[PDB]
Symmetry: C3
């Protein structure tokens, strides 16, 4: 997956960003089985005041997670995952749940590329990973926290 | 919905940002019935020159609106909504309509979370809201212009 | 199309951004037949360290391309275009392909607006073009490198 995380500048320190990324990644792996190294968290910071709710300019305490996923998972699983991202980001960012928005979009795995390779269908990550070259496998394994 | 609005840095004053957010939110509310406070406009600013059209570097005048919506509305209504966004953002930002791109993407409401809660299906926002806890309604209600 | 290109601040010089934009635009035009001026490349820069893979903070050498397209093309074609974007961005940005992620999302052309006009279905770009006013055609024609 790629989780785009839209937050205000300086609302998350580097250690908070790290904690948030770990919480989202742990949730994704925990509920889908996808290896840690296949989950990206991409923080997009903007000055406070660039978010409007109902036309009302907001302070710096809002977070929008746009998760981009492969098609093929059940609505039940996606609901569980969205709920866990809400719960665990709330803890990691020390932010009330009312300030968290989470949207999941899905695309065919056949039009999703990670580490320069096309993704497998959900659930087939082990066979896919075993089929990768030694260097590729080693390079991915550097991305596990 | 969440409207990601990609603009150049300093192209929009705070007042023009407020105006553009109001134009989009009013258009969404007017055409869908969804309450003002359920519409987020999220400005993403980048330095002028980061936009290319046909490989040609642009100045700071281009606007791309990526609207993220729940599934369930008609193609007829979605066309009316995108046209109104083009028309009203053009006025609010004082930008010629030719500089405006607008893309709508849709997701099942079951995988969309706002204010920490999953959204209802389109058209059921009234009873959804009435059934939220009193502190959640109060928090939401403030985001109205 | 709109290709959102997420990169670290300072990783691409102005010339490298031009080269990457041209490589993506030339890949899209070459494989879909859509004219150059209908392809936007939109660079989104963030400070290095805002990207995490598997919970691990990354340096400045990662690229995520989010291509937003009309529905209607085959999986085979989308695969070739994703692969060519990987290959040609690798060259243009001087970045190993293992650092490149590319996701394609699709929407109905009927809810996609460019230059203030609704897009036609894939393959019908020629006829769509010469039916716009000459002022709209003239404005688009400049956006060709």
């Amino acid at each position: 997956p790629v989780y785009m995380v839209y937050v205000s500048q300086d609302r998350l320190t580097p250690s908070a960003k790290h904690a948030v990324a770990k919480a989202i990644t742990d949730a994704h792996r925990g509920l889908t089985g996808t290896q840690h190294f296949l989950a990206q968290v991409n923080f997009q910071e903007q000055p406070a005041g660039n978010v409007f709710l109902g036309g009302v300019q907001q302070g710096g305490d809002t977070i929008f997670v746009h998760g981009l996923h492969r098609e093929g998972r059940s609505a039940d699983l996606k609901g569980q995952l969205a709920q866990r991202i809400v719960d665990d980001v709330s803890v990691a960012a020390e932010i009330d749940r009312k300030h968290i928005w989470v949207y999941f979009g899905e695309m065919p795995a056949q039009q999703m590329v990670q580490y320069g390779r096309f993704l497998p269908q959900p659930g087939h990550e082990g066979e896919w990973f075993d089929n990768l070259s030694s260097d590729e496998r080693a390079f991915m394994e550097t991305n596990v926290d």
